[PDB]
Amino acid sequence: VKYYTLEEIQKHNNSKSTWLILHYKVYDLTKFLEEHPGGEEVLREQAGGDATENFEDVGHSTDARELLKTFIIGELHPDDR
Template sequence: MEKQEVKLFTREELKNRSSREECILIIHNEVYDVTKFLEEHPGGLEVLMELAGMDASEPFEDVSHSSDARSLMKKYKIGELVEADRTQGKAAYAPQWNNDQPQEQGNWSSWALPLLLGIAATVLYRVLFL
């Protein structure tokens, strides 16, 4: 079985491929032609069109796509970015292929600061005005 050669693209050549007739996205240095998926996208075609021709890695991860969505996108992959155009620091929004991660349960720091500020404001009010 022959290894299939990966088609390489530059960001420059992709930036104008942003129409309903040709909608290209870059996600984690891989290039996807989502033109045929525009009407099927659960979030609406506007979401994809807004990012067409650009790097959509961060918005893609912000939405927390399911493992099914990640699997589906494989069929739209048409290539990858050339080495010089690849994002090196993608750890900030690296793909998390396992969506079965436990949800964070009640992080105490998310409520401790507002609680302390409320107590301080109450004490200050009582000292100054009562």
């Protein structure tokens, strides 16, 4: 496992680097921003933070969750969970 602090994840909130936390897992979605069927805006608003509630609320297919696995870079540090 690779752990990332909330302090570190929060720096990745822009077009050069966008990270997202979903259910304690950290994803680098920089290359996915323009490819997202739900638009760049919803991802840009949540960039550098936890979006678990937002992701589950709209509903996402198993296909969306399998695609999500390809962007995983680590997990949120246990002290920030």
